[PDB]
Amino acid sequence: KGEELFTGVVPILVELDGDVNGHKFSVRGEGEGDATNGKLTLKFICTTGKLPVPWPTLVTTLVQCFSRYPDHMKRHDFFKSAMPEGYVQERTISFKDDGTYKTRAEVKFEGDTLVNRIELKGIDFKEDGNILGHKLEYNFNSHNVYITADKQKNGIKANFKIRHNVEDGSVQLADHYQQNTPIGDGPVLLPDNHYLSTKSVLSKDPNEKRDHMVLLEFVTAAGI
Amino acid sequence: KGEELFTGVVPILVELDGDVNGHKFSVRGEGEGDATNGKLTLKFICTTGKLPVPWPTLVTTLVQCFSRYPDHMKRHDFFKSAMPEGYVQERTISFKDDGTYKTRAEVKFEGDTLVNRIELKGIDFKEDGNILGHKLEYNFNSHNVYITADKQKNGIKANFKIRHNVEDGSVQLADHYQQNTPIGDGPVLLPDNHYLSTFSVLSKDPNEKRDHMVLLEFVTAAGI
Ligand SMILES: *C(=O)O[C]1[C][C][C][C][C]C2=C1N(*)=N[N]2
Ligand code: NA
Ligand code: NA
Ligand code: NA
Ligand code: NA
Ligand code: NA
Ligand code: NA
Structure with a gap:
């Protein structure tokens, strides 16, 4: 089944097109994943020049x-069960006292490569807040x-709070609301809460230099 | 209490003297440990030219x-409870269808530095096996x-299987038997199985270049 596709080391491609407060940017990542050890290694570049948001704010969006x-x-394991056809991953990320990101991604195999293609839109960010202020x-x-099952959508939901350390010692919270649904019509595993x-x-x-x-x-x- | 010694980051020194099938070597390592995050970062050098065994075979021996x-x-947490006087860590490492390593180490504080000082002896290795053949x-x-408590020695025992990937696609198993005993006479924590x-x-x-x-x-x- 889908789990068999992850027994070894799998190449990964990540593509993101973003717009935050009208600042348009793109990121490309390449690396590999070793699910047997739960390990990812990737390098990301901002292909449009200077990233207009801090790199840490994009980690969860960027398998x-x-x-x-x-x-x-x-x-x-819903995620592997949806492969190779893949799944759609949608989120809202709400930065406390600041803006929001909305993201839609498709995660699927293209041949031997696991690809994560993402659109991100960010709005309502403060010009001199923690995000646009870097x-x-x-x-x-x-x-x-x-993670919890979403039987009505043949998928899952997730919720979590990301803690971003700020240079002044404070913590910037980013509340994440997530839903995942299969791309294909084949059977998937719907999980118990876990x-x-x-890390x-x-x-x-x-x-x-980029x-x-x-x-x-x-x-x-x-x-x- | 020993655990208090491990807040923040602590410098680490590792010194190993080895002899495997008559091939003698020394390794020195330096780095840091962050117990709050369970994180180690170290660099090891062979101070006797070319290491005569593969680096991965020494990872478990080299806190x-x-x-x-x-x-x-x-x-x-027995290990912190034994500090700063430290503990002796002894292992037998049996490589399937190959030789054995015997190790004895003392792990203790020397001033501000956590030191792991080790003697290793290896015997019965095949000259063109996975180890001496690199x-x-x-x-x-x-x-x-x-890990289990070893009440008879006021310490712990551990057992585990290391899987070393081999260049021909096979896996080289290394069975680890470990025993640890405190160096000092103060009270230590003896754990439940974990x-x-x-x-x-x-x-x-x-x-x-080294x-x-x-x-x-x-x-x-x-x-x-
Ligand atoms: C962090 O790596 O977590 C550990 C052990 C605690 C629970 C998660 C299980 C897991 C880890 N490493 N592999 N699996
Ligand atoms: Na690196
Ligand atoms: Na702006
Ligand atoms: Na902010
Ligand atoms: Na803040
Ligand atoms: Na450790
Ligand atoms: Na390998």
Whole structure:
């Protein structure tokens, strides 16, 4: 089934077209995913020049099918079950006391490559807030992503709070509301309530002159 | 209490002297540990020219006191409880269809630095096997380290299986038997059965001419 497509290392392509407060930008990422170890490694470039938002605000938008599900929880892995045809992932991300992102993404195999293609629209951001003011630290906390089935849509929902460290010591909260639905008509696994535990390390490539992000991520399912 | 020594970041020194089938070597490592996040960052160099075994085979030998124990599991953290006087860590590592490593290490504070000082002896290795023939991939899988109390020694025991990917697509198993005993006479915490979930990334420094390994590790306790 879909899980068989993830037994080894899978190439990943990420494409994002964004508009935040009228600032239009694009990001391209390339790397690999190793779901057996729940591991992602990717490098992202802003292909339009300077990114108009902080890189950390785009991490969650920029492939949960790479999560490591323990053997006893494999029947709850919706993400792999939807492959290779894939799924649509939609979110609203509400930054507390600031703007909102709305995103729609399709995650699917194109041959041997797992592709995540995303449209993002951001509105109502404060000009000198933490986002457009670039006041967020270049780091990423560990989170729990809470997943529940959405039987009526043959999919899932998720809700979680991202904590972005601010340079002044405060924390910028980003509330995430997520829904995923299969692209194909084949059967998928609808899960019992559980969560994904995430760990992320953001870095730079010292030889890279373009605006970019190097990302390492480990993600593991738990709670059943 | 020993756990208080591990707030923030702590410098780490690792020193290993090894002899495998008569091939002698030394390794020195330096870096830092952040127990609050279960995170380790280290760089190791062979100070005796070419390392005669693959770097991945030494990862487990080259500081479980840096593991993140969740708040509900803090009474099960033997490793920190033994600090600053430290503990002895001894292992037998049996490579399937190949030789054995015998290790003895002392892990303790020396001033501000957490030091792991190790002696390693390897015997019965095949000259053209996966180890002495350098047939192992430069990578590392995620593992669970199963821990139980060893009340008879006022310590702990652990057992786990390391899976080393081989260049021909096979997996080289390394069975690990471990015992740890406190160096000092103060009280320690003896745990209920649990495990450490380990995640490791190996890399190279492009400008480093010595034989070396850069390691990033996340370790979290679980199972209770
Ligand atoms: C962070 O990596 O979490 C750990 C162990 C705690 C629960 C998540 C299970 C998991 C990890 N590593 N692999 N799976
Ligand atoms: Na603006
Ligand atoms: Na703000
Ligand atoms: Na703030
Ligand atoms: Na990197
Ligand atoms: Na550790
Ligand atoms: Na491999």
